[PDB]
Design a protein around this ligand. Structure first.
Ligand code: ZN
Lengths: 304, 165
């Protein structure tokens, strides 16, 4: 009886992830991939039919920015969506048979609890860094992708502070280490909010990505599938030109590490509510996003 | 999205709608004209709403001039509103005439997450005057609580509410 149309505490989300894996031990496993600055576990749901050998997989990332609540809420509905529609929807069922889905609903647990209890708009980690009394680094400026180039601040008090060095944030290192150890990821989708954008590399430079053509095509296909639920409109493009320069971003790191299908979703809305998206929009957001996610995943299934 | 890193975007349309945006050049909240469609997230109905989004992490800025005066800014290092001397021109968004204004503006979206949920009366039929924080109004407002269940946005007095929220 988990209300997927409500925003939840970290505790509740972690627990629901556990129930999902309990109800589908055949299909879903809660794996701890690391810990946060404040020593909270980082949990992923692994979805698979491959009996424990490394298959090709897509990484679904959410909640790297803690105030972006629709992100985590969508990610956990999607956990339930994937299991509930396995062998009832040709679409996922066909994806799952070919490949594994790794889902990280709260990539920044410390920040998330901090938004729930202290500061609703908090964005960064809660790492405490020598040099300043300011707290946290922006985990989406912390990756080893033109780290510390244009598109990030070196002022620790900045919302977009890149941190002391690439992968300094243990939350980020945890994902990097785990994806690299695995070594055969094919898709990487990072969920954020808000603005309704679906973007692809690069953010650290105006340079076109070698796969820029196909990326835009898929993005647009996925954008259209998403629109086909309730009419929600997305714009598409590379990060640097669509929003701004951003150095050390996750989808750029991924793409430069041989994951071709690297996309960012900025979910709802466009500014009416902003970060404070009312709970009554979680499911509608999650339904539509699902189609865009499947479209991308189908496309990855087929290029394999 | 990092709202404060977006440029002004009037969009592709012909409307005439004055709004505010955070200007990265000057790091201050400024007026621009919106064309009613498309655009981006860096767009606010009032100056205070823009500062509440983008201003409160900036360092204090005295600026070039010396028509000096005592002002307040939200110090990101202490999360306290503190006094600084403003030269009179070219300052950034982190600048308020009074301590209270500085506190109320910068705390607008920085309250605990539970302060931003709708007041929930609950199922029960009691009537207990309780207060809750209403972010639309930006005030702790009286409401009437049923007596069981509900949520954390529920306080016995007003100063209790504004203490938490
Ligand atoms: Zn984000």
């Amino acid at each position: 009886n988990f209300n997927y149309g409500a925003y939840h505490s970290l505790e509740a989300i972690y627990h629901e992830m556990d129930n999902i894996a309990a109800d589908f031990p055949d299909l879903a496993r809660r794996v701890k991939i690391g810990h946060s600055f404040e020593n909270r576990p980082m949990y992923v749901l692994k979805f698979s039919t491959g009996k424990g050998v490394r298959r090709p997989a897509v990484w679904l990332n959410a909640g790297i920015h803690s105030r972006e609540w629709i992100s985590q809420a969508t990610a956990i509905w999607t956990a339930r969506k994937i299991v509930s529609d396995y062998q009832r929807d040709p679409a996922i069922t066909s994806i799952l048979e070919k490949m594994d889905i790794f889902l990280l609903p709260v990539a920044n647990p410390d920040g998330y609890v901090y938004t729930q209890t202290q500061n609703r708009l908090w964005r960064k980690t809660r790492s405490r860094n020598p040099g300043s009394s300011c707290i946290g680094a922006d985990p989406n400026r912390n990756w080893n992708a033109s780290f510390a180039g244009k598109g990030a601040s070196d002022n620790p008090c900045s919302e977009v502070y890149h941190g002391p060095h690439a992968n300094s944030e243990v939350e980020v290192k945890s994902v990097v280490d785990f994806i690299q150890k695995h070594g055969n990821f094919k898709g990487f989708i990072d969920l954020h909010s808000y603005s309704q954008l679906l973007m692809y590399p690069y953010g650290y430079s105006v340079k076109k990505a070698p796969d820029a053509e196909e990326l835009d095509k898929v993005a647009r296909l996925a954008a259209k599938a998403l629109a086909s639920v309730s009419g929600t409109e997305y714009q598409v493009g590379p990060t640097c030109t669509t929003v701004y320069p951003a150095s050390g971003s996750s989808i750029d790191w991924a793409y430069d590490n041989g994951i071709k299908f690297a996309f960012t979703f900025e979910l709802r809305d466009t500014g009416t509510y902003g970060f404070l998206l009312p709970a009554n929009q979680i499911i509608p957001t999650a339904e539509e996003t699902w189609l865009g996610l499947k479209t991308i995943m189908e496309h990855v299934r087929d290029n394999l | 999205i990092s709202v404060c890193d977006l440029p002004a975007d009037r969009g592709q349309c012909t409307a005439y709608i004055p709004q505010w945006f955070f200007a990265k050049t000057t790091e201050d909240c400024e007026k621009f004209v919106y064309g009613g469609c498309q655009g981006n997230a860096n767009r606010f109905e009032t100056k205070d709403d823009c500062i509440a989004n983008c201003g409160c992490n900036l360092p204090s800025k005295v600026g070039p001039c010396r028509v000096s005066a005592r002002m307040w800014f939200h110090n990101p290092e202490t999360e306290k509103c503190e006094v600084f001397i403003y030269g009179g021109c070219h300052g950034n968004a982190n600048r308020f005439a009074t301590e209270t204004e500085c506190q109320e503006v910068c705390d607008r979206y920085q309250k605990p997450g539970f302060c931003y949920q709708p007041s929930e009366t609950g199922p029960c039929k009691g009537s207990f005057p309780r207060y809750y924080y209403d972010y639309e109004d930006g005030e702790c407002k009286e409401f009437i609580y049923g007596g069981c269940e509900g949520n954390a946005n529920n306080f016995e007095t007003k100063e209790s509410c504004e203490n938490a929220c």
